[PDB]
């Protein structure tokens, strides 16, 4: 046995292209649309819960995931690749940061660590790149609210707002017209729902849409009282009912 694939499976072609990264981006293009919008007092990330079967319980499959109490993530592309990245992202936030500094990492540095993992799958031996693009929304004390995109290459860019996957070209155009620097969180959620409706074919409701925010601290979701400095997670996943309420005022 032994892993005898100690050589790179991603290499430069004569034209200077890295084929496997390009092909990974093509897999992301086929994936379901997901988006992110940044407001003055928060960030919203959203995507469609494309159910593979109506017998399947789509609540058990979480496309939007908590990485830290103040950082969340959503994707477009291959779901399984995303799931393992979230596992690694959660772990690296502890091992390479929290266990050292006694606090959760800021958004940009956690993104940097995830980006590193994805870059290594682009150069290391016997592996293909990750077939996903991530959108990571988060908050920290010194940088405030932020939204980052992370591609299969490992490259990452900060965004005011963006979209990835199936109908990203149209969705990004829609966001350019609506986005401004004076948006409140509720306005960003409203725009997120409008933008996402265009790319969805079938049912459009709280049960078929997955949406989460990075906003105010939630002391009710902390689980304990007695420490003033601990005020609760800024990450919150919106319920099915909470989404439907905002679809009436749509």
């Amino acid at each position: 046995m032994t892993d005898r694939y100690s050589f790179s499976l991603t290499t430069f072609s004569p034209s200077g292209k890295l084929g496997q990264i390009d092909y990974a981006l093509t897999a992301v293009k086929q994936g379901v649309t997901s988006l992110g919008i940044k407001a003055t007092n928060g960030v919203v990330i959203a995507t469609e819960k494309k159910s593979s079967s109506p017998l399947a319980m789509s609540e058990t499959l979480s496309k939007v995931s908590l990485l830290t109490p103040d950082i969340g993530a959503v994707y477009s592309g291959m779901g399984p690749d995303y799931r393992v990245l979230v596992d690694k992202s959660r772990k690296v936030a502890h091992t390479s940061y929290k266990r050292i500094y006694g606090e959760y990492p800021p958004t940009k540095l956690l993104v940097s660590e995830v980006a590193k993992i994805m870059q290594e799958a682009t150069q290391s031996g016997g592996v293909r790149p990750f077939g996903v693009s991530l959108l990571i929304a988060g908050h920290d004390e010194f940088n405030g609210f932020s939204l980052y995109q992370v591609d299969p290459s490992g490259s990452y860019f900060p965004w005011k707002a963006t979209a990835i996957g199936k109908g990203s070209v149209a969705a990004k155009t829609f966001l350019e017209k609506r986005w401004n620097d004076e948006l409140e969180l509720e306005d960003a959620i409203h725009i997120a729902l409008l933008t996402l409706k265009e790319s969805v074919e079938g049912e459009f409701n709280g049960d078929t849409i997955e949406l989460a925010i990075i906003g105010d601290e939630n002391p009710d979701l902390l689980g304990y009282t007695g420490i003033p400095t601990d005020k609760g997670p800024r990450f919150r996943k919106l319920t099915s009912q909470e989404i439907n309420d905002r679809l009436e005022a749509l």
Binding site: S62, L66, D87, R90, K91, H94, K98, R99, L222, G223, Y224, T225, G226, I227
Partner: protein, 225 residues
Amino acid sequence: TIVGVKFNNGVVIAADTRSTQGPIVADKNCAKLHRISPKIWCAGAGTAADTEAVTQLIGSNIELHSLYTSREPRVVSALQMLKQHLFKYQGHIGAYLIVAGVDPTGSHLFSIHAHGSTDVGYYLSLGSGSLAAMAVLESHWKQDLTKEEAIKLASDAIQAGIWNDLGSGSNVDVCVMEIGKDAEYLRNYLTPNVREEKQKSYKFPRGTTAVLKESIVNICDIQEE
């Protein structure tokens, strides 16, 4: 002095706030009540750095486990992870803990010895003041305690340690973990050892100390222009 007491709908733990190096008191208001997860708290005795580090490590791994499983953490998981870690280090990690909490299974109370042994109970005590505390627990504990009765019993047990044990002192910390509720951490629940006013002020006249040199320290970064 640390204690753990079970009651009707949950569990309560308590601790004193003295930290000592030999006969010297290093910290008069030390926090011995640690959080492993939101509704799982532990009290530690023995080597302070060991109880903190082993608590943070298992707390970190419990958080990651809770995220992986999409479930709230259980006390038996923290218990198992702690004892296996401590056992591996053959008692060289001097952490003696009382672990308590509530989870989907119910309310739980355990103790952990540094060599890796665990014990179950309705009432427990650890530390140099454990004997003073256990004497109180054995005298006043009963079945079917209320929340208010259990807090009283727990803090009374800690007081026994504060007054009668030289390794224990200062204040009383408490944490209550009731079923179907948020855990309430009661830092300095009791403060029966406030220092009396000093007879005199030792504020010196400015210029009393002899100086040789003065200088401004540059803490800022390198400047522009």
